[PDB]
Design a protein around this ligand. Structure first.
Ligand SMILES: C[C@@H](O)[C@H]1CCCN1c1ncnc2[nH]ccc12
Ligand SMILES: [Cl-]
Length: 167
């Protein structure tokens, strides 16, 4: 039993809700919140910009130190940093950016990072400003993640479409 509430169940291990991930995180304070990061951990907009803003820029300060020490992430890769006031940990995951010509096959590699954590609150990856089709992102998620994932979908119309077309 966990404290996530109001989710539709898609499969044994994937749950979905029309919600702002920032609000879900503040309410639930999960062990892991996933950020839709870029390789530079520059949290400018979308999920990352909103999460960082909710931390009063502490996420960005921590991230800049991470990059100064370690260099950029790989597309498809991840790192575990603090969750600040939103969660115990933040798993920063880089999906491919289709607007940059990055290989959509890397979306599966991105989702594989979720399997290192028993339970996560997450957005769909590579959608939003990253350019990919959220319907495809959901199928990759369901077919790749085996741990328990609670997906927060910001837009109501998209949420309704993802549920209605789910095979
Ligand atoms: C797929 C879509 O859901 C992702 C990509 C674009 C924004 N977005 C978000 N999802 C969940 N919570 C959010 N809070 C703020 C933004 C946001
Ligand atoms: Cl985004």
């Amino acid at each position: 039993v966990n404290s996530f509430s109001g989710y539709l169940k898609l499969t044994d291990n994937v749950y979905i809700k029309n919600a702002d991930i920032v609000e879900e995180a503040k309410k639930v304070k999960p062990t892991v919140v996933v950020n839709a990061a870029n390789v530079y951990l520059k949290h400018g907009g979308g999920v990352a910009g909103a999460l960082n803003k909710a931390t009063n820029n502490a996420m960005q300060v921590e991230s800049d130190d991470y990059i100064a020490t370690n260099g950029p992430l790989k597309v498809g890769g991840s790192c575990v940093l603090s969750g600040h006031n939103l969660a115990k940990h933040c798993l920063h995951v880089v999906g491919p950016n289709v607007n940059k010509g990055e290989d959509i096959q890397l979306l599966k590699s991105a989702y594989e990072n979720f399997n290192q954590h028993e339970v996560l609150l997450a957005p769909l990856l590579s959608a939003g400003i990253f350019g990919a089709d959220p319907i495809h992102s959901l199928r990759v998620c369901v077919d790749t993640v085996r741990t328990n994932v609670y997906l927060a979908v910001f837009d109501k119309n998209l949420y309704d479409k993802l549920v209605s077309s789910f095979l």
